[PDB]
Enzyme design. Sequence first.
Site, mmCIF file in Angstrom:
data_model
loop_
_atom_site.group_PDB
_atom_site.id
_atom_site.type_symbol
_atom_site.label_atom_id
_atom_site.label_comp_id
_atom_site.label_asym_id
_atom_site.label_seq_id
_atom_site.Cartn_x
_atom_site.Cartn_y
_atom_site.Cartn_z
ATOM 1 N N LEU C 37 1.705 -4.379 4.624
ATOM 2 C CA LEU C 37 0.522 -5.161 4.296
ATOM 3 C C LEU C 37 -0.381 -5.223 5.515
ATOM 4 O O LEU C 37 -0.189 -4.510 6.505
ATOM 5 C CB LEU C 37 0.853 -6.592 3.847
ATOM 6 C CG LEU C 37 1.342 -6.957 2.446
ATOM 7 C CD1 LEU C 37 2.837 -6.774 2.346
ATOM 8 C CD2 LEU C 37 0.925 -8.381 2.086
ATOM 9 N N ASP C 38 -1.365 -6.105 5.422
ATOM 10 C CA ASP C 38 -2.213 -6.506 6.527
ATOM 11 C C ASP C 38 -1.601 -7.723 7.204
ATOM 12 O O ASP C 38 -0.813 -8.466 6.609
ATOM 13 C CB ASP C 38 -3.625 -6.815 6.018
ATOM 14 C CG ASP C 38 -4.657 -6.911 7.128
ATOM 15 O OD1 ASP C 38 -4.296 -6.772 8.317
ATOM 16 O OD2 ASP C 38 -5.845 -7.119 6.805
#
Lengths: 306, 152, 80, 208, 385, 111, 114
Positions: C37-38
């Site tokens: 993910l971020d």
Amino acid sequence: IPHGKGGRSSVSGIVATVFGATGFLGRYVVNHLGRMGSQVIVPHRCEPYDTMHLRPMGDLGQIIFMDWNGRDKDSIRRAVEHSSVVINLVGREWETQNFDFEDVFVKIPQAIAQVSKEAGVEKFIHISHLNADIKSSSKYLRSKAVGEKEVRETFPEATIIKPAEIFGREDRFLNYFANIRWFGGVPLISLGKKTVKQPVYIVDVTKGIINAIKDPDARGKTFAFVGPSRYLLFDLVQYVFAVAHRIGRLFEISPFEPWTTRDKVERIHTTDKILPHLPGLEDLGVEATPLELKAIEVLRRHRTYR
Amino acid sequence: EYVVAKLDDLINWARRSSLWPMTFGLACCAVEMMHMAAPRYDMDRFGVVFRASPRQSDVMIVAGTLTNKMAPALRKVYDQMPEPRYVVSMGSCANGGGYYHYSYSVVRGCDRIVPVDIYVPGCPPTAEALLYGILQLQKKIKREKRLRIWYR
Amino acid sequence: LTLEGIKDRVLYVLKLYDKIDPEKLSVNSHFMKDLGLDSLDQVEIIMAMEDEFGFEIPDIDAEKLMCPQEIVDYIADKKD
Amino acid sequence: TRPTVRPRNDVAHKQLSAFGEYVAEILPKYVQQVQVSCFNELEICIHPDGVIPVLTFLRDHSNAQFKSLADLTAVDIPTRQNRFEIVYNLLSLRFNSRIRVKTYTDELTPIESSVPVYKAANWYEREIWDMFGVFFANHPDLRRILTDYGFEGHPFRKDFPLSGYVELRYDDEVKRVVAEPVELAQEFRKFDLNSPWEAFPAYRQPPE
Amino acid sequence: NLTLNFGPQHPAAHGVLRLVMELSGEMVRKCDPHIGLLHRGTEKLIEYKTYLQALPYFDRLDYVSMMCNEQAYSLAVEKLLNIQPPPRAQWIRVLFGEITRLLNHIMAVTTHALDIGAMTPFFWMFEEREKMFEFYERVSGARMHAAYVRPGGVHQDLPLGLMDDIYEFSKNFSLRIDELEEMLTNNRIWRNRTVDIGIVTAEDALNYGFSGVMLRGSGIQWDLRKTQPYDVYDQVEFDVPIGSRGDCYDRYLCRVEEMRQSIRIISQCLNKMPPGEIKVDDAKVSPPKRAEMKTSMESLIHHFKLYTEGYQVPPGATYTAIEAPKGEFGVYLVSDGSSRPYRCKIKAPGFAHLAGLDKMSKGHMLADVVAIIGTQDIVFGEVDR
Amino acid sequence: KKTTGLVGLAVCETPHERLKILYTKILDVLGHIPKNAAYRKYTEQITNEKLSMVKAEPDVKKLEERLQGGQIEEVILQAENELSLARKMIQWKPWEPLVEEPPASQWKWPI
Amino acid sequence: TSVKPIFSRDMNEAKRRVRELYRAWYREVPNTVHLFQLDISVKQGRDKVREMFKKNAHITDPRVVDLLVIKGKMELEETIKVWKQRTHVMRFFHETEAPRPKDFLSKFYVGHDP
Ligand SMILES: NC(=O)c1ccc[n+]([C@@H]2O[C@H](COP(=O)([O-])OP(=O)(O)OC[C@H]3O[C@@H](n4cnc5c(N)ncnc54)[C@H](OP(=O)(O)O)[C@@H]3O)[C@@H](O)[C@H]2O)c1
Ligand code: SF4
């Protein structure tokens, strides 16, 4: 020839001329033309005060106002003698108590198919309608297609634009709905058969002109305006009362600006999704607008919060 | 018609006989208008009453210098006016924003926001040419309401 | 009071988001070493417990969970 | 020399040479330069470690009252390797004497503010934040005064040009008053005015 | 708590100063106003101008003072340039410098008495005020905003007249100030409208950095008018008013006695003026006369160059302040050494005089708050410092 | 008198010994400071200069002369804060030498 | 660096602060969109929030990010209350501005290389 950024106070080469330009359509188009900067020459008919809200779009020296009737010739000629392009959007609904109303879509587009064309203009663009057909309906809907052919003799290449029904802020068709606070809300006419037409959004209308105004090569190849996805339903009339939760007239009131229990009531309920072989909007791109996002704006009734 | 067009020599006379102005005191052009209210060049009772509530106005007056922190507040009051309105801006800083003109935060013109009809020039217009601008405004009303719906 | 009760609630948070995870509702989606993910989008994962089942997230433990087991485990000692 | 020349005096030039001398004597911790102006003014250059106590020393005494905080300003100076220059100005009530406090700093290095020492610095201290970005320490309420809500410039420094970027305009496209990139009708013609030949002998530079 | 913003309302006074009110039912107890309606870009703008060219932007800094502003500028420049002004010129700067105080102290009462809501003392005094703008037009250039004081002293001499006019004017003014004494002093309701309002008297009334009235009339005797000279200004005799307690009604009664001092000083100044010259003679600062700039050779080169560029100011910082009729007036004029100045930071009143509205307001009504503001005499555009 | 001139204070209450405590209140705290800074050399100089003229002579009005403050109740405030001044002289250390000399060309004015 | 910081020390009091107020914006975007009476979709607001945080991610030095924290927090003071009268919030979206070309053949027909 152009110079620098066209943010404001530029030149951009073009010199247009927009007649009418006091209604809902013709005002909002010019409000883009004074943004990129040009010599916009707008002559009005008989209204010094009704153009007051127009001026703060062109910066300084870009707009100019003149007077003209239309049945006269040189008032439609003296102004247009120095320009490059010219569009027209003139016309309205019901017959005046003094006018003729038939030749206004015949000789008045011909009155600017006069020496106006001979003077050296190019990319002259007229407006059409998607439903203006030569069939026997209606008194106003037909007799618009008569101007589509009998005046098409002059200006052999025009790219006359053909819009569908439009929705914006202050039109007549969408404000015909919800101005019906009455002892009965009836649809047209208690049937969900033909509803509806193609409500193209008003930003797409003014965007189609400015791409075509130096396209190039768009003369004769007439264009049609696609609406939203896709046809439309009867739900629209129920969509009004759900989310709404159920200019030079006179000094007191106009005696006759009615709802017109005449051929007004049928000029919209005659949908005619016409030929898709016209190019006519997506090729003159890019125009893609739904209905569900712009519907909050124009509708305005008593709740205003919930 | 001689019968109908006789009527607007009362109505377009009556609106140029009673004007109820708003003033926006912002800068040094506000002070000179107070001396016009002072009874030397007595502004009252020459057709025009003194101050008035923001609702009941016909002629708004922008005086002084506009900043970007006042550009929203000007348009909102300009919406709330009724329909036969007029905008007349005194002061040389309401016509191009005087000097302060090359500054980073002054509205250039007071014309790119509201449409204004009569331009009085000058750091302070001396409350001597300003009654002249008002008699220009009543001279501007030679318009008509009949022979507008009677023509089209 | 059911320790299986907080197991269902956690394991439709992640796919209710239309982002990265392709129906991997597994307990070992280890959040940017497995899942991916971020750095900002981890904080948006923690967000949907204030409204679904109710939860506070007071402290740095949102920077500590890193796997949907520990999300259940941090609601495990919260509840029972 | 003549009439139409300002008659200077030596009495105030004597005591202000006298008074400020033993100020550095009794705090040789913060004071780094003291100078006497040729027209009865005093500068006490202070490294900003002693931003609070030296004011707190001038806050009260029996030989120096100095409780009238008049002027907080801010002067930028590029090409100094520490740009900005916070300069105070305070007044002795009982003695009729002016003295200024020149404290340099840089941009990112904060400054311990004078909030308990003076309560006239409530709106002055915030102004340097809005105009330069000099983040003072421990102020109870840092906000935006005298600028508009959407600026990102801190305009009173030198790299910010004369106009901004934000020339504002109205359109009837929907309702809004929208921003736009800046466009002028005229250049602001910039002249060239510095005549040569060095009219001043006294301030002659070190000739290198 | 209700969070009304009674301000942008164009309710007379001065439709500006938009603020918040976190009122506790009826009392306020929290006031946090907003300023910045006119920021105008002033202090950045002067950095491209010269000394003579930048000068009217000091004039337009008030609404009222025309010769008390530019008094704080030429005297802030002549110290840098080692010049005393010639003696005939100093008698005029005190004359018009003690005539603008008869414009603030008329406007500081009537406009306060209009927010309150009295009509007739607004019209009863501005009709007498018209007898005074004829002076401004006769001497300098215009109605109000006059680029009249220069760094080289006075611009030009006042013409024939203006000495049997001012003596004609000032001999019939004390009857007009005896009018408002009957209008407001002996009245009870206006006394009841302002007693014990804004009781700020402690040492935080000076730690807030206030200048005069909303000083000494509340207590501490100090002023810049006879402890610090300007020009020939100590050679006249007068006294300074002090009120009793620290409220608005004992800073109101400064201004009645203050106008009863400016009449004495004008009637003392006229007896003492000598004939003489106008400008500074050495002509590296003053322009030469018009009858001179058409004959000799030396006149034009010290004329034609003196308008392309300005003066030659030595470097070194400076600072001064004078008595504005509502306060001190700080100018910290940084000089660089050319025709164009460097930074020019100004201190005006209202920074102190309105940040201390937080202390002054609370514990009181909402209708008190509008009556507070017209006592400090706060003018916007002047809070642009 | 019932008003002290300067509004905001009150004559509270007794001269000649409210002062005489507060000078001697400082002098005992004055001895606590290590004596290398000349802060003691001048502050003890003026307090002994003051208290010698303070203690103990009539009247209140004579004590106004040769003691250059405001009124006598305000002369308390001249040294009231000074007691709060000298006790914080122990907290920070000004007697220490200079710190952070500027980088060798900064206080030169003409750019 | 002979300079004291503002709030953070090294990168770990820092990066937990930029995550912190992100939730305060995230519950604010649905809160104000019915308050300021403007009409777009609410997900566009959540895209523009993360638009602003992700762009400045090229910093490898403290007290600059901390300087943006003071900038980022001061934005919420007008935002939670009503100090931006229906314009400043609309100022975030370059809406009625004409599109920049950003293409080499497109720049070449219009402009003296701006
Ligand atoms: N695209 C659509 O969906 C749609 C729908 C309905 C109608 N139309 C037609 O397309 C155009 C859109 O107009 P609109 O929506 O902006 O409303 P509109 O008010 O009719 O605007 C068109 C302009 O034509 C002017 N006009 C009417 N008769 C005229 C005459 N003899 N001489 C000169 N001007 C005359 C009108 O008033 P003035 O005389 O004061 O200038 C008006 O300003 C019109 O031609 C309209 O008939 C299109
Ligand atoms: S320049 Fe004109 S508009 Fe501006 S403050 Fe002065 S008098 Fe008023």
